[PDB]
């Protein structure tokens, strides 16, 4: 599990390819599972879905298999990265 790039795209590795995760079926309760899994404890911020690899992963983080259904997961585990001038 990892977040990829400046838009926090939740990806999962083979088992030499990373593959993002479909926003089909996702909720802020499945969001927390991936966050704790990453080490962030009871920290959560946002788990919006964003625009689309070609192989995706559809539905904690072993309940998915490679799909397609519009929109991927953007997971933020913490409100970070802001200051005085935004």
């Amino acid at each position: 599990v990892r977040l990829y790039g400046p838009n926090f795209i939740l990806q999962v590795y083979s088992s030499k390819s990373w593959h993002p995760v479909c926003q089909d079926d996702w909720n802020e309760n499945y969001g927390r599972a991936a966050c704790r899994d990453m080490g962030y404890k009871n920290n959560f911020y946002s788990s919006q879905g964003i625009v689309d690899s070609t192989s995706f992963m559809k539905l904690i983080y072993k309940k998915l298999y490679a799909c397609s259904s519009k929109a991927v997961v953007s997971l933020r585990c913490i409100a970070c990265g802001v200051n005085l001038n935004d």
Partner: protein, 237 residues
């Protein structure tokens, strides 16, 4: 910080002053309410034990960091491959006994994600309480300066660091000097804004003197350590 300017309130709300024996020693960067990223060289023996360490967040001036008002550090974790001779893998974690309260002056920086696609000479900022000249004293006020990433090839050339710059390192500054980190700033942040977010790109690590031509700052490349950091944070409990 040589050649910077006083930080404004809440400009760098992730910056902490790390104190031993009632004085600033090191910088650090807040990533969670309880986790602070710093350099491994700061917590070498005999400062490896957490009891020696307190953290001040959200305060620009050393003279307003009062004895007994800091956050006791509870855990110190150095990178398993930290090599003090070469300064390779110079990252450590500090965990606070009590979580910080986030507000307008005290807030975390984002750990870098893979796929940042930074420019080769990405515009960054450095901050801290280091000397404002080579061999000077701790700065009373937090300072900050704009620096650019210096490409690894250039940084490793014969006339700069000559093959000392490993993949767990990144260089920044100006080869003419004048602007740089300095002693006291070490463990502190190198950050960059992208997609309207501030990211922790590096932790102030090493180099030759301060603000000299062809002797830029070297930072720990936090991107290569994020997975270790995630493991450390997950294992705690």
């Amino acid at each position: 910080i040589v050649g910077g300017e006083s930080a404004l309130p809440g400009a760098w709300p992730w910056q902490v002053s790390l104190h031993v024996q009632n004085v600033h020693v090191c910088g650090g960067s807040i990533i969670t309410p309880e986790w602070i990223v710093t350099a491994a060289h700061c917590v070498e023996k005999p400062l490896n034990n957490p009891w020696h360490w307190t953290a001040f967040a959200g305060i620009l001036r050393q003279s307003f960091m009062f004895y007994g008002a800091g956050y006791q550090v509870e855990k110190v974790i150095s990178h398993p491959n930290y090599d003090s001779k070469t300064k390779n893998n110079d990252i450590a974690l500090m965990k606070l006994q009590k979580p910080l309260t986030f507000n307008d002056l005290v807030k975390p920086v984002c750990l870098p994600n893979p796929g940042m696609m930074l420019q080769p000479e990405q515009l960054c900022w450095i901050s801290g309480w280091g000397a404002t000249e080579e061999k000077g004293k701790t700065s009373e006020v937090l300072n900050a300066a704009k620096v650019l990433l210096i490409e690894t090839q250039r940084c490793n050339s014969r006339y700069v660091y000559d093959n000392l710059i490993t993949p767990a390192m990144i260089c920044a500054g100006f080869l003419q000097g004048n602007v740089d980190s300095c002693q006291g700033d070490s463990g502190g942040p190198l950050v960059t804004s992208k997609n309207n977010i501030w990211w922790l790109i590096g932790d102030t690590s090493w180099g030759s003197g301060c603000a000299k031509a062809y002797r830029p700052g070297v930072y720990g490349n936090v991107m290569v350590f994020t997975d270790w950091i995630y493991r450390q944070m997950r294992a705690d409990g």
